[PDB]
C-alpha cells in the first residue's frame, strides 16, 4: 500500500510532504488548525518569508510559511530597524 508514508515513522507538516515524496496527501489531515491549512498551502508561494529579508541592518528573521518577523541589533530601531542609532 502506498510507498512514501506508512513505512515512514509518520507523515510530517511541510518539508517531508513538500517534495517528490508528497504534495498534500496525509500532511493535509496532519494539521488540525483551520487557518494553518489555508495560508500554509493555498498555492504555497507566499514571500518565502525572509526572501527579501524584512530585517535591515544585519537584523534577523525567524520566517514561517504564512508570515515572518524581524529582530534588530541593540544599536538599531524602527519598523525595519532601518535606523542605526550609532
UniProtKB/Swiss-Prot annotation:
Q: Where is the Gla domain?
A: 1-45
Residues bearing 4-carboxyglutamate? 6-7, 14, 16, 19-20, 25-26, 29, 32, 35, 39
Disulphide bonds annotated for this chain are 17-22, 50-61, 55-70, 72-81
Per UniProt, residues of the EGF-like domain are 46-82
Kindly list the positions at which (3R)-3-hydroxyaspartate occurs in this protein. 63
Q: What is this protein called?
A: Factor X light chain
Source organism per entry reads Bos taurus
